[PDB]
Design an enzyme around this catalytic site. Structure first.
Site, PDB file in Angstrom:
ATOM      1  N   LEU A 169      37.704 -61.548  34.140  1.00 34.51           N
ATOM      2  CA  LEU A 169      39.042 -61.262  33.668  1.00 34.51           C
ATOM      3  C   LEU A 169      39.090 -59.891  32.989  1.00 34.51           C
ATOM      4  CD1 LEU A 169      39.586 -64.780  32.057  1.00 34.51           C
ATOM      5  CD2 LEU A 169      40.512 -63.999  34.261  1.00 34.51           C
TER       6      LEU A 169
ATOM      7  N   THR B 175      41.622 -53.684  35.209  1.00 34.47           N
ATOM      8  CA  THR B 175      41.071 -52.339  35.321  1.00 34.47           C
ATOM      9  C   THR B 175      40.558 -51.857  33.962  1.00 34.47           C
ATOM     10  OG1 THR B 175      42.528 -51.817  37.186  1.00 34.47           O
ATOM     11  CG2 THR B 175      41.671 -49.966  35.879  1.00 34.47           C
TER      12      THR B 175
ATOM     13  N   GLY C 137      41.022 -33.086  39.536  1.00 34.87           N
ATOM     14  CA  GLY C 137      42.006 -33.667  38.646  1.00 34.87           C
ATOM     15  C   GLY C 137      41.627 -33.458  37.188  1.00 34.87           C
TER      16      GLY C 137
ATOM     17  N   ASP D 171      51.165 -51.750  35.302  1.00 37.81           N
ATOM     18  CA  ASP D 171      50.911 -50.619  36.203  1.00 37.81           C
ATOM     19  C   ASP D 171      51.628 -50.767  37.543  1.00 37.81           C
ATOM     20  OD1 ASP D 171      49.211 -49.123  34.359  1.00 37.81           O
ATOM     21  OD2 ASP D 171      47.586 -49.070  35.817  1.00 37.81           O
TER      22      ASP D 171
ATOM     23  N   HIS E  28      44.082 -39.621  -0.501  1.00 38.77           N
ATOM     24  CA  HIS E  28      43.283 -38.409  -0.483  1.00 38.77           C
ATOM     25  C   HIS E  28      41.818 -38.735  -0.716  1.00 38.77           C
ATOM     26  CE1 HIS E  28      42.495 -34.079  -1.070  1.00 38.77           C
ATOM     27  NE2 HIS E  28      41.672 -34.448  -2.045  1.00 38.77           N
TER      28      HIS E  28
END
Ligand SMILES: Cc1cc2nc3c(=O)[nH]c(=O)nc-3n(C[C@H](O)[C@H](O)[C@H](O)COP(=O)(O)OP(=O)(O)OC[C@H]3O[C@@H](n4cnc5c(N)ncnc54)[C@H](O)[C@@H]3O)c2cc1C
Ligand SMILES: Cc1cc2nc3c(=O)[nH]c(=O)nc-3n(C[C@H](O)[C@H](O)[C@H](O)COP(=O)(O)OP(=O)(O)OC[C@H]3O[C@@H](n4cnc5c(N)ncnc54)[C@H](O)[C@@H]3O)c2cc1C
EC number: 1.8.1.4
Lengths: 472, 481
Positions: free
Chosen positions: A39, A42, A183, A318, A450
């Site tokens: 499972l 991608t 790419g 997707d 900070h």
């Protein structure tokens, strides 16, 4: 021996497995069909997780092997790479997280069916297993979450041997002496960085004139490229690839030319990575027989409840339009099943962040300067460099800046762009600010701890709002 | 003109005179100038930046960062990733050099910021010698008078002494000496298990020291920390090698002829007398406001019983044009708290309203794992009678933490039971310090747990654990646990 279900999810990637879990939590009898051995889709198996693991491990290798650790008084006689062990650490993480999804399915009573799912009726999905056995699910709703695949380069055949996709590049068994990447988007630059750090001579070839893919702010992209070139990256931008030949001696000859025309040349390498994009995957799902037509780019058209033209059949992630990212798919899965139960369905793609996990990292959310110009929006700019941030200087890790884009009439934050240490975590404060409609002054007046890197986000908003930062 | 050091003794006129250049004072001075005030900042030390830059946040964080990396390389972590090294050696001189380089760069930066913003830097010891006058006494004995409309006291803090134990910064050190030890001590005892003490313990533990922390109270991490977080934090630190003696008082310490130190301890309630020996003793029981020789008694500004200057909500003292902020007044003794007080104080001088909510001021502990929180603890909500609900998510279930094999701890969110308003956020684990600022922004808007759960956090990031803990608080269940 059919199964009856309320919601049947085809695919177990970030969109599908999260949708299945949420549907079960909302009371739906839920099935999730997955064709692969594990499972997680991608992202878990060949995507986000293995890539971030190798980015982390190769960054630490660079810190130990290069100048950084020596500058901190951490002295080592001989730093050596054990690539098999580095790949093992990666694989251990993948295995743990994929197993975790299987336990989450059991914990939430999601039924896991292992097979290739095909929609065989308006209310039926049939999963065919590797041995040909079938499992039929009769179901009220169908959620298509079948994801993406690599976009092939015409005329160049990927074999995952010497011409690899991102999947092959994530599991190379030795550091290639010379590597070419077609790419220079997010995935390509990340994989370039891994193998550069481990000893490869890397060249990235890109048809467009900038690094980092679509939507990245141009100023951020040029500054990012300059830092990467100083790290050892070699870029051929505005360059098209005309072909690649697998040679008898095992090497690869890549023919390139200027994108505008002319200046033809050939470069040789040991590994070619083809990383020009990804595209929606819907193969053999049954869509044509149902009459569900794809858009020209292969996506499934859906409405604002993520319904296809057949209203009980949905699609997310997707496989539909929008940014192809894991957290986008997850949110679409959640809101789709919330909508099945009658609730509102909302996602704002302008509030979906993007991250590049190089060092320095890049992250952004909202609009770029190019988008605001194209839309005719009057805006103001605030910048703060990490060289002036106390935590970055204390860590001696001071590349980059935060850039904030603000609306002039209301002081509303329109976009946030971070190049430097901690960008990936920092963009989530920015995403909350955009979702809330924050003004630049709002964020300037929030008490940030900070020393933190987040103070650069505060100060860049102060510059955008008041005109001047405190520490720059 | 912009630097008034020894030899520069002509009288000055100003709208705002800031005494002290720490986080509170130097930011107040810059902001005052940006608002149009003729601004002076008086500092007695050789550099600007106060406790935080010179002996405080900055050197301590530098050593925490470097010692953590030493531990990753020298221990198991790098080997687990295929990074093989024959011999990992510590060069303490070089590690300390990296620290000093950072401090020098940042102190120089403040001086450049003063010049850029036209702040007049007077280098001397400031004393308030009239309602509208400060006199600075310089190193050469010279004096310089500043006639000023407003005075802003930002004189900071000092280490709180321990009666009977003399700090000499040799073998008995304060945090200042501990940040510059010349060699890794074989054994180190720390009196005080608050934030500063635990951080300094962790540094020297990582570099090879056997460390023990002795604490009069019954928990680690100082005031206000959530008790569940503190207990879990302590257990993690014990597995790293810390030894803790909680509910324990120190009765004395003797430097022996052989150079070692015998520390006499007992149970806070009485009994169980013991002695523990060490090479270095760090005295870290607190810090306290510093106002020495400031002229307050002659002005009639009385201090509260803990030495703080009382101020109203505009940060005015009893004398209405004399103000005070930072570690010298009440509230959390933290750098970003001092900064914010300085900003809003001078904005108030320029005519604006003045309001700060100390419940929105975060706290951070820069160990590994880090600890960070903002808003209310479970103890505060119970004591206040607030009905709340709890959401938790462990970092072991977060994809970025698991991928980096860095999985200690959890995010805990406290939400109002009826309204889902976020009331407190408590983070134990990697990235806590940066993550708490997302929580502080949420608190500013009065956001709900659902609000945060529905924000698209990037995958994979540590911030997803924050999203999921809010989802659990709001809906009752997270996705990934
Ligand atoms: C190298 C790489 C790095 C990446 N890094 C990031 C990152 O850092 N961050 C980020 O946000 N995104 C990243 N991504 C993108 C991310 O992986 C995708 O956006 C995300 O995985 C898409 O989720 P999904 O659920 O829609 O589809 P997928 O993850 O592609 O899952 C679809 C699943 O459906 C299964 N399936 C398909 N058809 C069927 C069928 N008919 N029957 C049964 N099962 C079927 C597939 O086998 C697969 O398991 C990266 C991608 C790559 C390739
Ligand atoms: C080891 C250590 C680590 C720390 N880590 C952190 C951390 O990570 N984060 C955090 O938020 N806080 C941290 N702190 C606390 C932080 O340093 C203080 O809260 C902060 O410095 C207080 O700021 P201030 O401006 O009020 O005072 P100070 O920083 O103390 O500045 C006061 C200044 O005034 C000067 N001065 C005083 N009297 C006069 C006078 N009469 N004339 C002229 N000049 C005068 C002093 O010389 C000094 O420079 C740490 C402290 C220590 C000791």
């Amino acid at each position: 021996q059919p199964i009856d279900a309320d919601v049947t999810v085809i695919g177990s990637g970030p969109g599908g497995y999260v949708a299945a879990i949420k549907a079960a939590q909302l009371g739906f009898k839920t099935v999730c069909i997955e064709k692969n051995e594990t499972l997680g889709g991608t992202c878990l198996n060949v995507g986000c997780i293995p890539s971030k693991a190798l980015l982390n491990n190769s960054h630490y290798y660079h810190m130990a092997h290069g100048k950084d650790f020596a500058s901190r008084g951490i002295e080592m006689s001989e730093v050596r790479l054990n690539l098999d062990k580095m790949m093992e650490q990666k694989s251990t993480a993948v295995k743990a997280l994929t197993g975790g999804i299987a336990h989450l399915f059991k914990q939430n009573k999601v039924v896991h069916v292992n097979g290739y799912g095909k929609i065989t009726g308006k209310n039926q999905v049939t999963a065919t297993k590797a041995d040909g056995g079938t499992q039929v699910i009769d179901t009220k709703n169908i959620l298509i979450a079948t994801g993406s695949e690599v976009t092939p380069f015409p005329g160049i055949t990927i074999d995952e041997d010497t011409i690899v996709s991102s999947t092959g590049a994530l599991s190379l068994k030795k550091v290639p002496e010379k590597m070419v990447v077609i790419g220079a988007g997010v995935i390509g630059v990340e994989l370039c960085s891994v193998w550069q750090r481990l000893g490869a001579d890397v060249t990235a070839v890109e048809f467009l004139g900038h690094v980092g893919g679509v939507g990245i702010d141009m100023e951020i992209s040029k500054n990012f490229q300059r830092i990467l070139q100083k790290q050892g990256f070699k870029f051929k931008l505005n360059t098209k690839v005309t072909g690649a030949t697998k040679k008898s001696d095992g090497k690869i000859d890549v023919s390139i030319e200027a994108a505008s025309g002319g200046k033809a040349e050939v470069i040789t390498c040991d590994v070619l990575l083809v990383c020009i994009g990804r595209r929606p995957f819907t193969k053999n799902l049954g869509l044509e027989e149902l009459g569900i037509e794809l858009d020209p780019r292969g996506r499934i058209p859906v409405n604002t409840r993520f319904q296809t033209k057949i209203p009980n059949i949905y699609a997310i992630g997707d496989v539909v339009a929008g940014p192809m990212l894991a957290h986008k798919a997850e949110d679409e899965g959640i809101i789709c099943v919330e909508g099945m139960a009658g609730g509102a369905v909302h996602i704002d793609y302008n509030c979906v962040p993007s991250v590049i996990y190089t060092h320095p990292e890049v992250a952004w959310v909202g609009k770029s300067e190019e988008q605001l110009k194209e839309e005719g929006i009057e805006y103001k700019v605030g910048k703060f460099p990490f060289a002036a941030n106390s935590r970055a200087k204390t860590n001696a890790d001071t590349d980059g800046m935060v850039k904030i884009l603000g609306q002039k009439s209301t002081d509303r934050v329109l976009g946030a762009h971070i190049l430097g240490p901690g960008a990936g975590e920092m963009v989530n404060e920015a995403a909350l600010a955009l979702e809330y409609g924050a003004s630049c002054e709002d964020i300037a007046r929030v008490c940030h701890a900070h020393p933190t890197l987040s103070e650069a986000f505060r100060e860049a908003n102060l510059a955008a709002s008041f005109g001047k930062s405190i520490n720059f």
